[PDB]
Design a protein around this ligand. Structure first.
Ligand SMILES: Cc1ccc(C(=O)c2cc(O)c(O)c([N+](=O)[O-])c2)cc1
Ligand SMILES: Cc1ccc(C(=O)c2cc(O)c(O)c([N+](=O)[O-])c2)cc1
Lengths: 115, 112, 112, 115
């Protein structure tokens, strides 16, 4: 799989488990169409979202349902979600890890792109 | 102004100057309607986007054009932009973003 | 003042108020000598730690007492403190720290 | 191993490879004594620093030589290093991952503590 999503919890110091993740691809009509989704595992990781065959160059959106996660922990959050929007680029083989570190009023995201 | 946006550059250790910022508000038909826009100043700050009267309850999206920023510095970054989406239930909101080519962070400082 | 420290709370979305900050400078014998200290204000900012004349070239450590901050809020955090160690080769330095119980970030904004 | 260190590069979007990492334990004389060290792998990870037998409750410092890393990339950095100082706590089994995300003028660190 060319795309992994990993979510961590900065309040509890733990993987963020059972977080819903939705991936969209930008369509020619310039709207976001759903592509793949899942929930993070006990390790905070979400594997198997797509395939090398399916994950062609394009503009993608990864939406992480952070609000439902904090609501389940009883902590008032600021953001409705975390979005990561990026253009994929075939240039040799590549794997993308989208990692997000969550706090109730802050999040960070980084992309680790490896061969 | 109840909303201010501050953008910093974690590569240069400087304010991120002249960054385009667009604010949208979700309408009754669930579409994103344009609300306000501007550019960050020499201090990295964008003041005066809206007023207390205009900034009613609702769901807002702040879109920071980080890609154009990095490309102007010769860097091809990962993200198309940095988004912040939030509900206002009411206060002053500062939306701060810290930028690197393959990472960004955003935090909200909400004071009264 | 050439050095200002700003501390924010990523759980509450607020400035981190009354946080203790200690600054050290490395001496010729490679020991850390105390240089200045203070507490963050209601804005999360600590101004006036030093002066242009006192803040000479050298290696500095800013130690932010994040543990006492979280414990006062009922949280047992991971880190004993947040450190920033840097060389001044000269300018205004803003050292900003964003705090969560098991994570912190720090950035330097260096302007002229 | 109860302690892992992982370092990522936010400029290149990659693991931070060959970064030196030094671990110290606070001694009774209240000075930092070296305990373990190594360099990050191609995955940005440093495994095998210590053992469950050796890693007793105490105050630890993890020092990451970020300055040498940025100097090797030709990018002027702000920090001399990144330090993570923490007290370990036996409370059921525990593994600590200390993760650091590096930029030339900024770094973040988080602890992922799992069973
Ligand atoms: C934005 C951000 C900053 C730090 C982390 C972070 O702590 C982390 C931890 C891991 O175990 C790990 O494998 C990765 N990774 O490979 O992306 C990141 C995660 C996200
Ligand atoms: C996500 C993140 C992390 C760190 C910063 C940050 O470093 C920062 C720096 C400032 O000078 C400053 O005035 C503020 N602020 O007002 O909140 C934040 C900004 C954003």
């Amino acid at each position: 799989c060319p795309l992994m999503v990993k979510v961590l919890d900065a309040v509890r110091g733990s993987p963020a488990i059972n977080v819903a993740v939705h991936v969209f691809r930008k369509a020619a009509d310039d709207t976001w169409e759903p592509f793949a989704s899942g929930k993070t595992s006990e390790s905070g990781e979400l594997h198997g979202l797509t395939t090398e065959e399916e994950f062609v160059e394009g503009i993608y959106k990864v939406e992480i349902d952070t609000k439902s996660y904090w609501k389940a922990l009883g902590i008032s959050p600021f953001h409705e979600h975390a979005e990561v929007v990026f253009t994929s680029n075939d240039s040799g083989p590549r794997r993308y890890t989208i990692a997000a570190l969550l706090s109730p009023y802050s999040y960070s995201t980084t992309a680790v792109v490896t061969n």
